[PDB]
Design a protein around this ligand. Structure first.
Ligand SMILES: O=C(O)C[C@H](NC(=O)CP(=O)(O)O)C(=O)O
Ligand SMILES: O=C(O)C[C@H](NC(=O)CP(=O)(O)O)C(=O)O
Ligand SMILES: O=C(O)C[C@H](NC(=O)CP(=O)(O)O)C(=O)O
Ligand SMILES: [Zn+2]
Ligand SMILES: [Zn+2]
Lengths: 153, 310, 153, 310, 310
């Protein structure tokens, strides 16, 4: 198991633990991923002292693994975040979210003249890394924007 | 079956060099030896939801030269999409059950791509999707550039005017960047510059490009001077200052122009090129349009005909 | 202050603890009242085991004290909630929400023609306990709305 | 200082029975004994950002009858609020530094209340705020009901037409509900029914009200038949079926009508009342509009004058 | 007869420092001791052929405050000049035979001047003529500046926003230039920079002035921060790139501002002064507008009343 050693947040039995979430980002993920829409126990810690980063957000969800809940997407909002799969109170799996080639449904193309708006289709953007500013190319209008213009739509 | 058989022609970005060359080699063959019945029993939809003269007429004329029939509309005001409110999806769902192919020009970007998801195995050819792409226009430009420069590599190309909303330069730049050692000179007002994604792409390929405030600067190094019109119908209110032509080409500006250099321009012009240029040997926009018949005949042939043209 | 219990929460001094939040409500109070727009340490537990409520949400906010008017706003969404003020680990104060007369600068008038929109003013509604819901009367347009329809922001 | 001195007149919901009676008591006094110089050195703003004929003219006339000056606008099209994009908060912020009181009518509900938040100690009078309230109209109506009925309690009042978007009926129902034993009969389409917050309010006070499908049903019990026009300028696209008047009062429908009964109507009418009714003893909408002068004179007098009218 | 008796008030360029101080002196006396009947039997024409909220209402209010009557229009669409094609000269030839003074605001520059050539001894007061002059706006400004700074000499004044078309800053600049040691800071977009004639005039008098790209730069030295709105209704097609405010003042930008500093702004504002500024002690545009009453009363009294106010 994992007891308390000057770390006031270490206890759960089988589930997902999203660590290293940047401050002011933990509440976003909770929203986008609809993580709270569940009957499972969730523990959330915001503005936690991080010798690692400085101040971090932390989330723990029991009996819930985020593999199809898009770690993909998570790669965008919390690049440095770490996802650990827990079982028997111990970290059996650990990983870093890796940038996807694309993102579908979730996002909305900034381009106001893009055909995507008035039609029966799901969004889709090709992800590409530049410099602390991920660029997104709309599948339809082919125009490109920064994740800061698309995510903060 | 050739590489382009039953394929959608949506964006140059999705076409290889072999594909572009395949088209040009075919255009030359058909230009040399016409084939009046190649598409004898085909019916093709000509759907223009946006205005057009050269693209629709050349395309429709190309079809007839190959023996195919044409149906469609040149104004979405008579279709049930406008006079009864209909999605592009439903419009394509039905038209694709009628015709052998669909050539379409739309006011919104992404329209052609959207269209492919609704036309089960009925080829969609993008005749221009609002400021985004214009693939065929590029095939025609490639053909012409080759015809007058003898090649498509190692050329000094300058594109002047509205480069942000110029769907023609977006495609052309991407296409010429698929060849070796081409250098780009971009001359356009700040508010209408060449989109970052084209520039980043050029960098990724190590292609050389530079910006300039006038034509005179580059006039002596350019092999092709590609003029463009300011896409007034796509400009935003805060850009109406650019509606007028900031760069005007006159017969005199060509005194120190290379012998081979040719002036091109997707023809709808609004004083970006003074009529006095028409007489000079450098004017080549009317012959360019004419090349539309050949590039487009080849495209249709390859898309609707499985066996390569002899 | 807990030791001889089966609960998994511990160690907090000088702050606020909102308890007995009905399940699926803890996240609403959090977003609806901008409770996470702070630099202070936050600890949330969703779907925590509850003796009587069966299940419950739990919010703890260090170095923050909700006033009597704020605690009462909670009554619109978590009447059963219980509030304890903390300091030096001592739970000095304890209270309960009581339905307020008004709730200002929190919700947005559903009325599209209500003057409050394109104008330099903060929303405000009269709160009226009704059967099965709570009626909210815009101080501007005077239209009444179901608290189950009035949005945030 | 009388109870209404320097007070905002926004909604009936915020006034008491004493306040109302005071206005009516004053209106009667001034009607019997005019006072041409009561508001002698006052300048009042008459700000109508929406159309009006009766309210604005009667209000301005009332001001003149008391000796006050008037400045304003009967159309927000010449003001900088429209021709230059300006918030109401800013408009009230500047106008309140010029005048002694502001009379305002606005297309959006809540307008008058908002104004009070930007006019430090300059009274704001609601001349109508887009389908919500119409305080003065009510005062006018109460004055008229008391004149013809002898009282304001234990009356049978029926309200026909657009009760949903009828700011006049919202105010009038709330005021009459401040008096004892009144019974209401609401006759209106389903799509334009009296607001639930109005009905709930009536239930809370133990007031009797009931719905009806026609005027014939209640014609023989009513003391006051309050007709209203369909508020077309406020209806939603899905309600345009109501634009036309579903209930039309004709001279003949008054055959079994109580001798004392009066037909009232805020005044813009569009066929809800046949002109053959104008000649009957029951037609009382013009003398009603006429009472607008005395109700409004009294209101201005009590709000701008500290000492009660003798 | 005081010096301004029966004088036209067209441009600040025609007034002396004496005239300005005279108006301010009178404005202070009327503020402290009102004179409700000073213009008892005068009828003044308030003629606005162009939009206005503050100027027309405070002028008209001022006239009533002095006991004068008002006639006119706030829109030239009802006048026979628009609905019947009429020259301003004719419109003035007749209106000047009806009233004792003419206050006018017109969309074309020079209107006020032109007017004086057609109003036989009937004084004309310019209420704004296009993007040229706004004399009484300046008077209100000088009053406000003297009120808050204690003087009109040796001040650091910044003017931000559209200075090319701001008829307010033109007048104000020329007026402040009539006083000693004032220093100017112009913060405007190249396309809307202060006209050359103002600058050459400041130079000729040895007045110091500098251009700046931000408010932060000058925020520590300025006594008066005069914000202006982009005169969208006067911009040329090629300037629509500027229609949006390029300089936005927020309450955080005032952290290093002098205690005595005051933010002024004629008023229709549009996002160039965050409303969070309104709460700060520096905001003073609404009070500025309040003084419009005293400045205009004084002007009317000095122009239409022979003896100086006691
Ligand atoms: O050159 C232009 O201004 C527009 C350009 N024009 C053409 O392709 C020729 P047309 O509009 O006649 O088909 C385009 O984007 O479609
Ligand atoms: O217009 C109506 O139907 C009723 C009522 N009418 C009036 O006030 C008369 P007016 O619009 O001429 O002032 C109103 O709500 O504005
Ligand atoms: O409108 C402006 O931006 C400045 C100035 N404004 C005013 O005088 C106030 P108004 O237009 O409300 O009379 C003007 O030039 O008319
Ligand atoms: Zn798009
Ligand atoms: Zn509202």
């Amino acid at each position: 198991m994992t007891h308390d050693n000057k770390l006031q947040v270490e206890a759960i039995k089988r589930g997902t633990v999203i660590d290293h979430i940047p401050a002011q980002i933990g509440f976003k993920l909770l929203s986008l991923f609809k993580l709270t829409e569940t009957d499972q126990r969730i523990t959330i810690g915001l503005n936690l002292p991080s010798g690692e980063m400085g101040r971090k957000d932390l989330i723990k969800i029991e009996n819930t693994f985020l593999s199809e809940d898009q770690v993909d997407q998570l790669a965008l909002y919390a690049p440095q975040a770490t996802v650990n799969r827990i079982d028997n109170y111990e970290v059996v799996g650990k990983s870093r979210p890796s940038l996807p080639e694309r993102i579908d449904n979730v996002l909305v193309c900034p381009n106001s003249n893009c055909i995507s708006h008035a039609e029966p289709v799901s969004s889709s953007f090709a992800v590409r890394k530049r410099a602390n500013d991920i660029a997104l190319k709309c599948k339809y209008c082919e125009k490109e924007f920064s994740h800061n213009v698309v995510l903060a739509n | 079956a050739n590489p382009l058989y039953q394929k959608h022609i949506i964006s140059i970005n999705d076409l290889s060099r072999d594909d572009l060359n395949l088209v040009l080699a075919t255009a030359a063959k058909l230009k040399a030896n016409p084939q009046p019945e190649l598409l004898k029993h085909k019916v093709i939809a000509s759907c223009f939801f946006e205005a057009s003269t050269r693209t629709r007429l050349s395309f429709e004329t190309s079809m007839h030269r190959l023996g195919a029939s044409v149906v469609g509309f040149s104004d979405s005001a008579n279709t049930s999409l406008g006079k009864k409110g209909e999605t592009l999806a439903d419009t394509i769902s039905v038209i694709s059950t009628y015709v052998d192919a669909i050539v379409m020009r739309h006011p919104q970007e992404g329209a052609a791509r959207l269209a492919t998801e609704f036309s089960g195995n009925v080829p969609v050819l993008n005749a221009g999707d609002g400021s985004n792409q214009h693939p065929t226009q590029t095939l025609l430009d490639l053909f012409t550039i080759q015809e007058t420069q003898g090649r498509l590599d190692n050329l000094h190309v300058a594109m002047v005017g509205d480069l942000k909303y110029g769907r023609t330069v977006h495609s052309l730049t991407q296409a010429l960047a698929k060849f070796d050692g081409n250098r780009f000179y971009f001359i356009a007002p700040d508010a209408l510059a060449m989109p970052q994604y084209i520039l980043d792409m050029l960098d990724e390929k190590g292609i050389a490009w530079s910006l300039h405030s006038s034509i005179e600067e580059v006039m002596a190094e350019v092999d092709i001077l590609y003029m463009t019109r300011v896409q007034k119908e796509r400009l935003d209110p805060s850009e109406y200052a650019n509606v007028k032509a900031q760069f005007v080409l006159r017969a005199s500006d060509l005194h120190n122009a290379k012998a081979n250099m040719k002036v091109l321009h997707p023809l709808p012009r609004v004083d970006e090129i003074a009529t006095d240029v028409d007489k000079t040997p450098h004017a080549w926009y009317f012959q360019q349009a004419g090349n539309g018949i050949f590039a487009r005949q080849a495209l249709l042939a390859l898309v609707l005909n499985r066996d390569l043209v002899l």
